[PDB]
Amino acid sequence: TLKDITRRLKSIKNIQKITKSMKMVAAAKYARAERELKPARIYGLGSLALYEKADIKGPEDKKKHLLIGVSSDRGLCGAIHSSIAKQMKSEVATLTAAGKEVMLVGIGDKIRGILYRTHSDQFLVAFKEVGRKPPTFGDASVIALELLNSGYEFDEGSIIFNKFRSVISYKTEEKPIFSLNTVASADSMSIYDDIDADVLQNYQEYNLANIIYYSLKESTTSEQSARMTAMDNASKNASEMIDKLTLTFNRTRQAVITKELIEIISGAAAL
Amino acid sequence: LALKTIDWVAFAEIIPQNQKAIASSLKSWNETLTSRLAALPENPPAIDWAYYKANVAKAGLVDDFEKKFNALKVPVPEDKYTAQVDAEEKEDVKSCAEWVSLSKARIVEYEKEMEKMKNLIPFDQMTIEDLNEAFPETKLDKKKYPYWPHQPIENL
């Protein structure tokens, strides 16, 4: 029917316009995210230089684990939240199969929404309003407080984020999070002078905040790139459907004109 | 056809874990047989021979059919299974009443003990031997620890 085809044409044209505008907006936000990712990367990677020079190795036999997953509250990205959820589920499986008591944290509503139906006994806290405004160090500080002011004395942790490689490529990375007992009991830390348990506690708290900040600043850039490419693809597909439906519409309008002519001609020929 | 109406959760509370499937199957067959007794009447409609006396022009075949049918002994099946479940019910009632008398013994002992605890002398007229009689877990293991303080020092 001509009216159905016209309805569908108008609908898909609106969809194409909206996805094009969203691609432009994601490009504008990704520019700023990739600009802010340089000093944030220097900061967050200098925060980890100690554990790479002292070669902290974590415990092999400890019991409790804390698994953080970094995502946002916004969709239309692609395989961002799904990658985080797949890694989190795989790691929870591989840890619980080793007897380790695992507790989950989800930064961003999408990861909690994905994992809350199957992994909800193994859950500690989640965080909301991640993605609208760019992440700040205040966000990492708040997450680190509510991870510290929670009473869950973990033995080891991991944080699963989307490390940004390029405009097209991001890779789901995982970083370790050590406890006071892991960095205090290490034999490679005997060369660090003027150290007691209190300074190590303060240092581990600050480094938790730092690794959360670094993960947020990588994930925001990865997600803005993914959303830009996803909206680009959506606009491409909408244009394809628009072309096919325009062909169908022209066909149908020609057929309708011919049918009306034939009706008029057959009415006139019967007189 | 006098049936015993049955509660269907009480039937569930009394089923051990090695015959839950059997209880479910008995329940399903109970419902199936109720439905099937509902979907067929009690007595077949004995058709009058009228439509077969005055509308069959054949030599007595309808008549000999009706004679052979009026005097047919259709086999009524016998129970052969209710007597043994009655015997099993008798045996089970015996075992259950025995266990219940045991439980009443335990209950009278518990009631004696609760009277004993309720009639304790107040704790400020109480010696330490009286406490070791009331709550025997508060007694010093003077065999495992023969020397003072008769307990681990950390316990203090």
Partner: protein
């Protein structure tokens, strides 16, 4: 004490298993009887009806 009294209540409820079994035996025998009567009726009427139809 409460637990023991509850155990006694369940023991008192025990008899429904044998009620169920007896119900099923009686109902199966009745279903079989009525199906047999319907079979004999249907065969007799069916042959008489073949005669009347030819």
């Amino acid at each position: 004490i409460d637990t023991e009294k509850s155990q006694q209540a369940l023991v008192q409820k025990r008899h429904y298993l044998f009620d169920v079994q007896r119900n099923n035996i009686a109902m199966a025998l009745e279903v079989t009887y009525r199906e047999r009567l319907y079979r004999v009726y249907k065969e007799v009427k069916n042959r008489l009806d073949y005669h009347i139809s030819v």
